[PDB]
Amino acid sequence: VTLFVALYDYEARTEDDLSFHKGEKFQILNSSEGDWWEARSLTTGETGYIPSNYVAPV
């Protein structure tokens, strides 16, 4: 299991990143370090690339 939370709000500025507010949950499926992890929004269901530094393990 890999449930992470957004420590801060983020405004997706591209069609590859996602947008949410601090307190949202995300399912990291492919991190591999780097800078942009792929998390799936459990609220909307759409998956995208959110800032790895903007999420943390619950």
Residue 44 identity: T
State whether residue 43 is helix, strand or coil: coil
- What does the chain look like in DSSP terms, one character per residue? --EEEESS-B---SSSB--B-TT-EEEEEE--SSSEEEEEETTT--EEEEEGGGEEE-
* Structure determined via: NMR
Amino acid letter for position 51: P
Q: Residue 1's Cα: distance from chain center in Å?
A: 15
Instruction: Give domain 1-58's CATH superfamily.
Output: SH3 Domains (2.30.30.40)
Joined together, the tokens standing for residue 17 give 């990143």
